Design the sequence.
């Protein structure tokens, strides 16, 4: 009903942000994938 | 460029400890400033430095195994490093057994 | 560098192995040293009597210096003739191994 | 003139209840430290096996989650906090969750630390905070957190 | 009361004492204590020492230059070195997270507001938001 | 039957290796783009097997 307006910003200020270090752990994980094109040799043509 | 490609590192300068024996010219086995090494160190200075070619060269000998290798670094401008200066990289951890 | 002091060196003045431009940091067993206690003249160092048998160490800055230990690709030549009344011979840069 | 209190997503600590829910087939959401947040599920039908999906949102008619077979580890469950996917949501990412000890300024200009026992929201989406020993509900700006 | 602590509030007083040349003790977080000092002579600059014990014939302090940050001084607690007390033998330190029960048998958390003792050595503690005193047993040390 | 005979074999075995040195051992990146905050990632080691 009411018009949709941007309004004001909400992000607060942050100071002295420290880096993230990957934590060592013996526990298992799952490796986040990327699905995309694969490159391969033309082994048949290599035989030729 | 250097601040971009570098890694945060603590730079502490080196200087001969006063504890050196005046006659033999060799150091005390234990003292607060230097732990047997004949060279003491100043307070650290936070610094960004680039590092390359890092090598963990292992030599197996009758005395035992020994870790020694070459690592090539490149500093910022206006910094005049000296021989046997010391650096430590808290971020990077090394496995040993 | 580091030096050992004795009752004789205190008066003569310590002969330095290097030259001097300025001193960065001095120290001894009793701690650091201030400008009020030491002086340098003609590239040798004097100390007051408080450090008769103490050790002294210094971090020092000195001017860069070099000597020519070989001359390499020693001569390169050009008969420059363009825009000259007559042919002229010019010696191009030498390379030095310092 | 407000909205009723909003429950926080209770983490599950006991492995036994986790396994029971999994056997029932209810979805689980695992906060992996190294590689983000993932969903865990038991395959339907006779061929039982665990499945994972990174389609990290509530299921919707226009957004159907895809499940990949994975050999989920017990240690992963134990060391990583796990939540029921029916609860864990973007609805309220409150800066000061329930049972958190926070520092609040009292009227006598003396800073005190109290544990948040109840949290609710209002029309504007604000976060009203209830602290033990006091009836008036504080606001986000007034409070402060002390860590370590 | 106990005379084991006399923290400085204003940084201006800290600088005034540094001008006078008196040594200071500066605490740290999960880290060794520090002593700070102003160098004598012509050139004025800050100096620090990792040692803490009193100077003696068998023990001498070591001083070196350091670019001390005013942030540390203003934030961290500061004392006069000569008048500092090593420890007050109490179970709970000042400004420590503790748990207790209110007058209506309701559990509540707080930090220690004051550390007190009687003439017989019995220690009483006052918490924030609680005027009354609490026994050592009645308190509980909250785990981080 | 082969009490005092000789025997010879042509055999297939799995490939195996051990790490005899670690070379160009650590390479690093402060990845910051499209992150809430700066993150440190260890890039691939090279091994001399
Ligand atoms: Zn030494």
Sequence:
């Amino acid at each position: 009903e009411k018009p949709y307006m941007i309004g004001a910003n909400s992000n607060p200020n942050v100071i002295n942000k420290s880096t993230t270090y990957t934590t060592t752990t013996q526990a298992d994980e799952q490796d986040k994938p990327k699905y995309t094109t694969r490159l391969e040799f033309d082994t048949i043509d290599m035989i030729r | 460029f250097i601040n971009d490609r570098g890694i945060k590192v603590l730079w502490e300068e080196a200087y001969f400890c006063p504890c050196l024996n005046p006659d033999t010219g060799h150091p005390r086995v234990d003292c607060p400033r230097c732990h047997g090494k004949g060279i003491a160190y100043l307070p650290p200075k936070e610094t960004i430095m680039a590092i390359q070619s890092q090598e963990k060269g292992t030599n197996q000998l009758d005395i035992g195994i020994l870790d020694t290798g070459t690592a090539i670094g490149t500093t910022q401008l206006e910094k005049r490093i000296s021989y046997r200066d010391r650096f430590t990289v808290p971020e990077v951890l090394m496995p040993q057994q | 560098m580091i030096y050992f002091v004795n009752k004789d060196r205190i008066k003569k003045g310590i002969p330095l192995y290097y030259d001097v431009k300025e001193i960065t940091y001095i120290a001894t067993q009793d701690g650091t040293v201030y400008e009020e206690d030491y002086e340098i003249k003609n590239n040798r160092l004097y100390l007051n009597e408080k450090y008769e048998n103490h050790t002294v160490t210094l971090k020092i800055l000195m001017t860069l210096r070099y000597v020519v230990s070989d001359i390499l690709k020693e001569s390169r030549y050009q008969y420059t003739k363009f825009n000259q009344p007559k042919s002229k011979f010019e010696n191009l840069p030498q390379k030095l191994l310092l | 003139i407000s909205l009723n209190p909003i429950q926080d997503a209770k983490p599950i600590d006991d492995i036994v209840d986790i396994m029971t829910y999994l056997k029932n087939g209810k979805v689980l959401r695992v906060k992996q430290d190294n590689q983000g947040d993932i969903l865990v599920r038991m395959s339907p039908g006779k061929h039982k096996f665990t499945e994972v999906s990174r389609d990290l949102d509530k299921e919707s008619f226009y957004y159907k989650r895809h499940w990949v077979l994975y050999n989920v580890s017990v240690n992963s469950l134990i060391t990583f906090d796990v939540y029921l996917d029916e609860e864990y949501s973007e609805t309220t990412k409150v800066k000061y969750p329930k049972d958190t000890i926070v520092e609040y300024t009292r009227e006598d200009q003396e800073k005190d630390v109290a544990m948040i026992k109840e949290i609710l929201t209002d029309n504007n989406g604000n976060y009203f905070y209830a602290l033990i020993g006091e009836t008036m509900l504080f606001d986000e700006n007034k409070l402060n957190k002390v860590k370590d």
Chains B and D do not touch (no CB pair under 8 Å). The pocket of zinc ion is lined by residues B 17, 19, 27-28, 31, 33-34, 40 (CB under 6 Å). The beta strands of chain B are 7-12, 14-16, 39-41, 45-52, 58-61, 64-67, 72-74, 86-88.
